[PDB]
Amino acid sequence: MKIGVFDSGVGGFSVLKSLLKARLFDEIIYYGDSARVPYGTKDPTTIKQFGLEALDFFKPHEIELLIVACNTASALALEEMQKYSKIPIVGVIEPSILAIKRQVEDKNAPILVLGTKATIQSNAYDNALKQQGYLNISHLATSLFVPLIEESILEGELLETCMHYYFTPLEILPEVIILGCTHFPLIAQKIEGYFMGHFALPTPPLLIHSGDAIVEYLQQKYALKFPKVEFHASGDVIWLERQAKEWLK
Amino acid sequence: HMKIGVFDSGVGGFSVLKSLLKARLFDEIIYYGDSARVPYGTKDPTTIKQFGLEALDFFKPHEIELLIVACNTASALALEEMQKYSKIPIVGVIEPSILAIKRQVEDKNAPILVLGTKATIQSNAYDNALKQQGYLNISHLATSLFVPLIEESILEGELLETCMHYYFTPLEILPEVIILGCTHFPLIAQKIEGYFMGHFALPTPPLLIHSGDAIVEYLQQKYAPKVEFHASGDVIWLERQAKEWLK
Numbered sequence: 001m002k003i004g005v006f007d008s009g010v011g012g013f014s015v016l017k018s019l020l021k022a023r024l025f026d027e028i029i030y031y032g033d034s035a036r037v038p039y040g041t042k043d044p045t046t047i048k049q050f051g052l053e054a055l056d057f058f059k060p061h062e063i064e065l066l067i068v069a070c071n072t073a074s075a076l077a078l079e080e081m082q083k084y085s086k087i088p089i090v091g092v093i094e095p096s097i098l099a100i101k102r103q104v105e106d107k108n109a110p111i112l113v114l115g116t117k118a119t120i121q122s123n124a125y126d127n128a129l130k131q132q133g134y135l136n137i138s139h140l141a142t143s144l145f146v147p148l149i150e151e152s153i154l155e156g157e158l159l160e161t162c163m164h165y166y167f168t169p170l171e172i173l174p175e176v177i178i179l180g181c182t183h184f185p186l187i188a189q190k191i192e193g194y195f196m197g198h199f200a201l202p203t204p205p206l207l208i209h210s211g212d213a214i215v216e217y218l219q220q221k222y223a224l225k226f227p228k229v230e231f232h233a234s235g236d237v238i239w240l241e242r243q244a245k246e247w248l249k
Numbered sequence: 250h251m252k253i254g255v256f257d258s259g260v261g262g263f264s265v266l267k268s269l270l271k272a273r274l275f276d277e278i279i280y281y282g283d284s285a286r287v288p289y290g291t292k293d294p295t296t297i298k299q300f301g302l303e304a305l306d307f308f309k310p311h312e313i314e315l316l317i318v319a320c321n322t323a324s325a326l327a328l329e330e331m332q333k334y335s336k337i338p339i340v341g342v343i344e345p346s347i348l349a350i351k352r353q354v355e356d357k358n359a360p361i362l363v364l365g366t367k368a369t370i371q372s373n374a375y376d377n378a379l380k381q382q383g384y385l386n387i388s389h390l391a392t393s394l395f396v397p398l399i400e401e402s403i404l405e406g407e408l409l410e411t412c413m414h415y416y417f418t419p420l421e422i423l424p425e426v427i428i429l430g431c432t433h434f435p436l437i438a439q440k441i442e443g444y445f446m447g448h449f450a451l452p453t454p455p456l457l458i459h460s461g462d463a464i465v466e467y468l469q470q471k472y473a474p475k476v477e478f479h480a481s482g483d484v485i486w487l488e489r490q491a492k493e494w495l496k
């Protein structure tokens with residue numbers, strides 16, 4: 001069972017981490033479009049075309065399944081890629097909606113979606129959630145989290161000031177926070193720390209992680225069976241691969 | 250008079266275009282921002298060099314007489330390769346700033362601080378050019394996060410101040426001259442001035458070198474209105490930015 005994983009860059013390693021721990025696949029071809037990252041600050045037309053070009057990369061690798069680890073590509077390009085692909089394509093949004101259906105029974109629970117500008121602007125999460133009957137959805141583009149995390153700024157004053165900048169205007173205290181971006185799991189503890197410490201909460205809000213959600217879904221569709229992993233990039237492949245160890249820690 | 254091209258990785262090049270429009274230098278300007286692939290400064294030399302070659306292909310049907318590479322990163326990494334494969338003159342934004350420093354900084358021991366993207370700083374393009382002119386006291390600092398902050402319009406407040414503190418606190422030298430070696434940095438030039446002035450009891454701010462004003466000065470010494478906007482990403486998104494950056 002040979003599969004491909006597509007991301008705009010290194011963020012997809014957060015999904016790869018979950019896929020490796022699932023012992024579901026024999027071979028994984030990871031491709032990050034690191035020459036053109038980020039996607040989330042760009043426009044739907046551009047991102048759709050990026051997604052179609054990603055299918056071109058995987059043709060010669062004869063994969064049986066393509067995972068779109070990128071939340072931005074999942075939000076803007078997945079439907080377009082599915083129309084032009086003969087093989088199945090799974091993105092990271094729809095499996096997250098199923099995880100919310102299992103873990104969040106109160107349809108009035110305040111849910112906060114965090115993502116790139118493009119992910120939030122698409123309303124992909126809001127639309128899917130509303131389709132399942134959720135009525136209390138807020139969304140917030142937290143663009144600068146992405147470059148901060150890529151510089152390894154995972155704690156301290158800069159992160160906290162950035163976190164305050166985005167979260168201060170919040171009118172509803174969330175019970176659920178969707179980490180609708182590959183990078184955000186790396187600051188999950190800091191995000192929950194912010195809400196406990198600024199809203200005097202007993203426990204933290206519940207965080208939904210895209211990689212864990214897609215694993216749950218994939219396991220419902222594939223038998224249980226350390227896979228072989230290849231790394232490829234449109235920028236320097238060593239600059240990409242050498243960061244894997246730090247993301248898969 | 251000359252029809253010219255201006256190339257940048259995205260919208261930052263509007264800081265250079267603004268200077269060009271103020272000076273009323275050229276009759277016709279074709280601006281191209283590679284907004285589908287920005288930023289360049291966080292990527293590797295091989296990638297950036299190829300981006301620079303591809304920009305030349307864009308301008309071929311426009312019959313330009315001069316190409317200004319407004320991007321400091323492309324100037325630092327791709328200019329030589331671009332000039333090799335192009336029939337038309339190409340001017341980047343690094344060498345005109347060296348000329349500006351030579352005119353404005355007569356003390357070869359004056360502490361000069363170069364700010365730029367990761368790729369611009371790693372290239373040592375500025376340090377090498379300054380050393381060849383006899384400057385003896387050069388420091389450099391990549392300030393990568395200034396780029397996304399400025400593109401989000403974070404031009405004041407606690408987040409910008411904390412980011413400046415993050416990059417500048419480890420500095421060992423107090424600069425007399427600061428090179429704004431990135432298209433985006435003129436938009437926080439007053440804040441950078443204010444950082445050093447406050448944190449260091451300076452009577453006057455360090456001299457800031459603006460790439461756009463330096464290249465205007467240079468072009469006036471060599472070549473003693475219509476603008477069109479093109480983009481690899483959505484062109485209306487780039488135009489919306491043009492209105493804000495060029496105001």
Ligand SMILES: Cc1ccc(-c2cnc(-c3ccccc3C(=O)Nc3c(C)n(C)n(-c4ccccc4)c3=O)o2)cc1
Nearest residue numbers: 020227228229230231238241242243244245246248249
């Ligand atoms: C068991 C094994 C087998 C082959 C190699 C190998 C081959 N060429 C590299 C290489 C070259 C340059 C820069 C970085 C690396 C690197 O190390 N690449 C990683 C891989 C391939 N894998 C699978 N992982 C990983 C996965 C999960 C958790 C932690 C690490 C890597 O980090 O390494 C490493 C180990």
Ligand SMILES: N[C@H](CCC(=O)O)C(=O)O
Nearest residue numbers: 008038039040071072182
């Ligand atoms: N991979 C993107 C984050 C980085 C980018 O903007 O490309 C996402 O999951 O939204």
Ligand SMILES: N[C@H](CCC(=O)O)C(=O)O
Nearest residue numbers: 258288289290321322432
């Ligand atoms: N235009 C780039 C900044 C943005 C980027 O990294 O592409 C520069 O002047 O260095």
